[PDB]
């Protein structure tokens, strides 16, 4: 039955978030020199007292219990009791700077000026009228590429008198769609440059 009440000249400060203790007491250089034979015992005893104080603080910390069982998310089950560590106090530098907020793009400035609120973006499904099905409006099997696979396309009158008369309207629409995609990519790279 050894005592568990460590008595110290200067009170030890604690960083329970980092599980650390700091005592600023006096250490004898002759008792801690490498010539002595009791130096390791001295170091062990000092660490023993500091760890006793730290463990007393940790076991005096408030505890979190739960009634949930195993097999669910969370990790802590009913039998486990967890210490609630406070926020750490020691100031440590970060490895990387804070993420800078990206400057407003041309679209964002225009939308702010005209008061255009952002879209709700509920989903990608749209109802096709000619059928009785809901189809994606873009992407994998999207409804933006149905003209590519349409069985019959009427040639527009405006294409007459041009060298594009003999070209497939499906191929023309694919070219126009790809040009729009590349225009969007170029606008994004412009925003990144600016």
């Amino acid at each position: 039955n050894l005592p568990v009440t460590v008595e110290k000249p200067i009170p030890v400060v604690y960083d329970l978030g980092n599980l650390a203790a700091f005592d600023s007491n006096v250490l004898d250089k002759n008792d801690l020199d490498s010539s002595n034979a009791r130096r390791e015992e001295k170091i062990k005893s000092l660490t023993r007292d500091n760890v006793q104080l730290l463990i007393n603080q940790l076991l005096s910390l408030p505890m979190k219990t739960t009634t949930e069982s195993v097999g669910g998310t969370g990790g802590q089950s009913s039998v486990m009791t967890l210490l609630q560590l406070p926020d750490p106090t020691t100031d440590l530098p970060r490895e990387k700077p804070l993420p800078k907020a990206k400057a407003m793009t041309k679209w964002e400035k225009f939308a702010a000026k005209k008061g255009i609120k952002p879209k709700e973006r509920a989903g990608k499904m749209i109802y096709d009228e000619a059928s009785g099905e809901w189809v994606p409006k873009w992407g994998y099997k999207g409804a933006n590429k149905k003209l590519d696979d349409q069985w019959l396309v009427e040639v527009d009158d405006k294409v007459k008198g041009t060298d594009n008369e003999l070209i497939d309207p499906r191929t023309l629409n694919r070219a126009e769609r790809k040009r729009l995609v590349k225009k969007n990519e170029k606008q994004q790279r412009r925003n990144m440059k600016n």
Binding site: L59, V70, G71, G74, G75, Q76, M80, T81
Partner: protein, 270 residues
């Protein structure tokens, strides 16, 4: 025609990977990865199969090499009453039951830690199953040992789509076939089938059962008695050693080839 450049630039794998018995990709996720950052120590129930023995070990990883907490082997099953088929599904179940009961007995869960200063009751013992380089198949003896340990009382997280009796068309198990595999109904069914079909193969296989006059209907009874005896007394008894450490060392060093000195080697050269 390997060259000096090849031998210098060669980058050898780890030793356990060269003599492949450790899967490090699986082991790093077994040891170093945690679902939560609460610093709960992890334990592995390692199950291994030789050609004549089943090894089950409860192991805690340590920075200076992992430490076995408790172990059980299938050669201890003759002590509990199973002298034949020490590497079958029922033997795996018995080994799992034995290691589970032995661990519980050692830890005191059923018949001064720092958790005793915060909580009133002890946690159930959680171990994660370690299978090594073994195929996960529906009806494997490693999952038989898993079932045995789970019935013994260790908490091993598991799903039952690999136990025998699991239907593939529907996510449901057949506990009748599971109990048949637990008490060796498949081996007894093979015994009866061979005895009725071909006496020639039943002469070669299952010869010890004939020698001991053990019928093809008492397998369930002896497995039940073995389970009861394991639950009654799971404490590990070391085998009484006939010869001592120094005697074994001397007798083996007599057979091992002695070392020849550098001067003797130079004399042989010249």
């Amino acid at each position: 025609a390997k060259s000096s450049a090849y031998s210098s630039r060669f980058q050898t794998p780890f030793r356990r990977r060269r003599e492949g018995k450790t899967d490090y990709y699986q082991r790093k996720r077994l040891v170093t990865q945690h679902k939560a950052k609460y610093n709960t120590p992890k334990y592995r129930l390692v199950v291994r199969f030789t050609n004549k023995d089943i090894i089950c070990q409860i192991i805690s990883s340590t920075i200076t090499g992992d430490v076995v907490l408790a172990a059980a082997y299938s050669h201890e099953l003759p002590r509990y009453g199973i002298t034949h088929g020490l590497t079958n599904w029922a033997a795996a179940y018995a080994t799992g039951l034995l290691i589970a009961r032995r661990t519980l007995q050692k830890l005191g869960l059923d018949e001064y830690e720092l958790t005793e200063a915060v909580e009133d009751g002890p946690r159930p013992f959680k171990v994660f199953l370690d299978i090594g380089l073994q195929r996960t198949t529906t009806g494997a003896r490693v999952f038989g040992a898993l079932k045995g340990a789970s019935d013994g009382g260790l908490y091993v997280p598991h799903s039952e789509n690999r136990f025998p009796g699991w239907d593939f068309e529907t996510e449901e198990i057949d506990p009748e076939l599971l109990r048949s595999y637990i008490f060796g109904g498949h081996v007894s069914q093979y015994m009866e089938e061979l005895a009725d079909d071909d006496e020639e193969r039943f002469s070669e296989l299952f010869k010890g059962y004939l020698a001991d006059d053990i019928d093809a209907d008492s397998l369930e009874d002896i497995y039940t008695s073995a389970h009861e005896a394991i639950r009654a007394d799971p404490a590990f008894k070391p085998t009484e050693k006939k010869f001592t450490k120094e005697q074994y060392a001397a007798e083996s060093k007599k057979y091992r080839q002695t070392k020849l000195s550098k001067e003797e080697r130079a004399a042989r050269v010249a």
